[PDB]
Design a binder for this molecule. Sequence first.
Ligand SMILES: CCCCCCCCCCCC[N+](C)(C)CCCC(=O)O
Ligand SMILES: CCCCCCCCCCCC[N+](C)(C)CCCC(=O)O
Ligand SMILES: CCCCCCCCCCCC[N+](C)(C)CCCC(=O)O
Lengths: 238, 239
Amino acid sequence: PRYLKGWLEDVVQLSLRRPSVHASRQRPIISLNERILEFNKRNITAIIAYYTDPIEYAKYMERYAVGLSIKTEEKYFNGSYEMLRKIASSVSIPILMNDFIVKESQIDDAYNLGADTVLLIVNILTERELESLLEYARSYGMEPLILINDENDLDIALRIGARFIVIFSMNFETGEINKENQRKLISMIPSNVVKVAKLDISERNEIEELRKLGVNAFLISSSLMRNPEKIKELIEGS
Amino acid sequence: PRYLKGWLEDVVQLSLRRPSVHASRQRPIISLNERILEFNKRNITAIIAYYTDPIEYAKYMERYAVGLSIKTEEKYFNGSYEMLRKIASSVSIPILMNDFIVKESQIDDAYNLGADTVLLIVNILTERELESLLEYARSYGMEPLILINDENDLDIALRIGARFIVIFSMNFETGEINKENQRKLISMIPSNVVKVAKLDISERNEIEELRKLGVNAFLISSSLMRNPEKIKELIEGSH
Ligand SMILES: CCCCCCCCCCCC[N+](C)(C)CCCC(=O)O
Ligand SMILES: CCCCCCCCCCCC[N+](C)(C)CCCC(=O)O
Ligand SMILES: CCCCCCCCCCCC[N+](C)(C)CCCC(=O)O
């Protein structure tokens, strides 16, 4: 990967050592990106539920969300592989594995655990690595969601042929999104790319303008909320 | 302008020396790109008639075309400023003045002759010139149609904030379009740009699939045909 600083370098160092799992999947892959496209056709707002017990939430969100985002990074985000595997086997909507993917065995894990795609982060990989890991996931039938954070990220993402892009424009220190830069990046992205905008639930009212801007789906974090129904009702009312 | 070679250099040097005109516009701007979006909303195929007796042709296509393109380049395309004024004073659908625009006075000419927008061509202009002519056209209420011919063109147009793009991908000596590169370029354009594809009338069967790729309108040349009813009926049939 890249040679970074601080906690990002630590989580990169740790992820490079992530032991792979013995596991086998319960169902075939459900394409997250194509389901988003089918939600667009049917004029249903496509929201990836960004989860931070987890089985209860996944059960509730299954009837409403276009897909589920499950954190598996262990040191800084309290995730686990077993959590993912349990969620993936008892739900039948696409599961996105959310982690710091730096080697091919992590894509094996995601696949063997029941995930339907994985997150790739341009800003921690070389261009060579990103194309190699993008093609490795596709070998399993997984179009990964590629996280872009700035213009250079997007240049690389389009050069290697990414079809599934999530736009952050976030400071990896604080965690705040520059909405202005996010809008910019979204507007530079080809229309044959499935575009996902990262939001917090407090900015839920930006959804409609972002749709008109070309956004196909939304990766929505619910901050400190714990009640799936209340999360869902707050999304619904906007 | 950029440095160029062949006939393209010649027409660009001729255009730098194009005398301006002093006419008075006889009706307000009718926005071509918005009318295109109106047609999209109504599921009416939007086609810009690429005219190539012209007043009879214009009066006839006014009922069906989303807009008209009139050539005003004089030496190679047999166009004239006076033909543009007479057509524009006679139909009520948007008019596109198609020329080699390298200076602001030509945009003045378009406005004063009654055109509703202008063509700008990425590959004959520097980036600064193109951004400058873009805003000057916008000073009159003309969102120009920006012509892109390759990926470097498209990169420059999206950076300056082109909202209205026509995709050619044409060998500028022969006039032949690389069809699969035209489709590549179409798909590289963000979804919120109004997209126009150049077509020959013999390619009218590609319209539906081009709509599916995200194309909003079609700049259709009718080749050698001389009967405007036959031209319309040939397109009417293929839908
Ligand atoms: C798998 C999902 C991708 C999103 C992860 C983005 C990372 C940015 C979030 C901020 C993380 C901040 N923490 C918790 C590590 C604190 C570190 C603060 C610091 O830089 O000093
Ligand atoms: C090359 C010159 C192009 C002139 C534009 C001719 C368009 C022909 C359309 C004929 C109108 C037929 N209508 C009345 C049924 C409308 C068609 C509806 C549709 O767009 O499918
Ligand atoms: C006229 C408004 C601009 C539209 C874009 C022009 C593209 C046309 C390209 C085809 C060029 C064909 N020609 C005949 C002009 C070249 C031959 C000139 C010559 O050597 O006689």
